[PDB]
């Protein structure tokens with residue numbers, strides 16, 4: 001018989017329509033011989049709305065604007081519990097995952113800690129340094145430190161960084177290029193109105209390279225792809241890089257996945273200069289996942305189709321759930 | 335007139351009975367004239383049950399083994415208003431229930447998802463301490479897949495970077511399961527083996543000969559710290575420490591609280607040698623909270639009674655939630 005999947009999408013976000021696009025794309029691709037699929041739409045105001053047993057192709061976005069949260073997740077329209085929930089969502093700080101955890105629903109992708117520790121750039125860049133992964137010169141610090149010891153942060157910038165620099169909210173868009181200290185201070189002032197944690201990174205001129213990784217305990221990595229502002233002077237997959245650079249990038253991605261302790265997936269984004277110096281920029285525990293997003297296309301280039309990827313992520317979710325149950329039994333026993 | 339408070343306890347954990355007991359102490363300590371109280375018991379099997387209108391002393395743990403959907407249980411109080419504060423006293427020590435509250439927009443006592451989760455992962459915790467520059471013992475970390483594939487390199491790393499004895503610890507559990515003190519390679523192999531029954535990630539720390547000293551902190555934006563106490567279980571409050579050392583511990587505890595993005599509270603545990611070397615061991619995002627536990631006893635020593643501690647924690651929960659609503663747009 002079929003397994004029972006629930007795709008959850010929408011959310012209270014500025015990425016609301018992207019989420020719906022992703023749901024459309026995933027729905028139109030999920031292997032419907034294996035899976036009986038229900039969907040849940042979370043409205044812009046957080047009202048949860050359900051539709052059972054999607055079977056036809058979704059022609060339009062408009063269809064997915066559907067017209068007790070616990071009650072919706074705990075049973076499928078076959079009467080059975082879900083074998084897995086696919087979150088496609090604010091819903092990227094690890095909170096929805098905690099909800100799945102408490103309701104004991106198996107779920108696709110990263111768990112609470114790895115979700116939260118990829119959205120917090122200060123924690124992420126500290127884990128990267130612990131792994132020995134090369135990074136561009138930077139500093140990270142808390143608002144409460146800058147408010148009381150400004151001079152000590154500004155001294156570090158002077159000693160460690162060269163202009164231009166990028167002021168980056170560690171959580172949250174607020175990202176600003178700064179060419180001197182006056183701009184730096186205004187960039188910090190602005191970022192700190194809304195976030196209480198910040199990263200300042202030295203500006204670089206480099207290509208943006210990304211690697212997709214898939215798995216739980218035995219992750220595998222794709223050949224890298226490239227994000228360009230224009231292809232003629234957009235995605236390009238594979239990336240035009242020397243063999244040994246690609247191999248190094250693949251291995252750094254796997255390492256970054258292990259250090260941050262991801263589940264299911266991660267996209268690792270790097271900077272690569274013209275003379276092939278590599279720097280890890282960040283991990284994305286919830287990368288873009290439309291039919292034409294970098295994460296799935298990188299896997300398309302490895303011979304892994306969009307339907308099969310979706311199926312693989314589902315299997316990895318069941319596996320992680322089972323693994324957690326075992327260890328719980330073992331702990332309760334001893 | 336009274337503020338609306340919900341106590342949540344039980345859980346699928348082995349510490350079920352300690353949870354229920356904490357709940358008993360907090361219920362019996364709660365100011366019933368300021369506070370209208372409901373309670374939610376989560377069974378071992380994981381069923382949620384509610385009793386409304388707690389107005390009398392709880393006489394037994396038995397009583398709280400209570401005999402309706404989860405969002406409905408949390409979103410409305412018996413006073414016909416949302417709760418002003420929900421107190422999770424329970425799965426709990428890892429940021430999952432916190433995520434549920436965030437999504438349901440329920441106000442809650444204590445730490446958010448990030449603080450609660452990174453404090454249950456020894457590796458992440460240790461990165462935060464390092465970034466702040468708080469002193470900690472040498473250590474390494476590795477996953478099971480890595481040990482399987484690089485057993486020899488890891489054992490050699492442990493011998494190069496760390497001095498025996500060492501302590502092997504599951505990175506993700508909060509209880510002494512799987513911890514063992516290892517005096518040499520053969521004991522380490524057996525400690526690692528044994529720790530892998532329970533977790534998929536481990537840390538190995540250089541051992542010290544030290545006093546275990548703990549500091550309680552309380553607040554949101556302006557946290558305050560208690561004098562340190564010693565754990566030898568007899569609880570020595572305040573610890574027998576020189577004055578300058580006491581102050582150092584207090585300030586490091588406040589810096590730990592902030593670096594880990596805590597709310598409400600944290601307990602910071604340290605190691606202090608005979609000659610006053612300090613190493614931070616951990617932060618606990620949900621320290622034991624019975625009337626006889628270290629966290630409240632440390633606040634008693636500062637003249638803050640257990641009832642008043644509970645009331646301050648409730649006020650802070652309300653303050654943080656109000657700040658969340660204010661910035662919701």
Ligand SMILES: Nc1ncnc2c1ncn2[C@@H]1O[C@H](COP(=O)(O)OP(=O)(O)NP(=O)(O)O)[C@@H](O)[C@H]1O
Nearest residue numbers: 136166168173175201202203204205208269281282
């Ligand atoms: N150190 C840097 N040097 C030069 N440019 C940078 C640097 N850091 C960021 N940028 C630019 O700012 C953009 C967005 O910031 P980035 O840190 O890449 O966030 P992101 O989450 O990876 N992508 P997005 O959220 O879509 O902006 C990058 O794609 C670059 O174009």
Ligand SMILES: Nc1ncnc2c1ncn2[C@@H]1O[C@H](COP(=O)(O)OP(=O)(O)NP(=O)(O)O)[C@@H](O)[C@H]1O
Nearest residue numbers: 471501507508509510513539540541542543546615
């Ligand atoms: N590096 C170390 N050196 C010396 N003793 C240690 C070390 N690490 C742990 N211990 C001892 O073992 C105990 C448990 O380690 P800890 O990291 O506190 O794990 P835990 O799960 O928090 N258990 P508990 O401290 O009882 O709540 C400590 O309280 C010490 O008694």
Ligand SMILES: [Cl-]
Nearest residue numbers: 553554555556
């Ligand atoms: Cl405060």
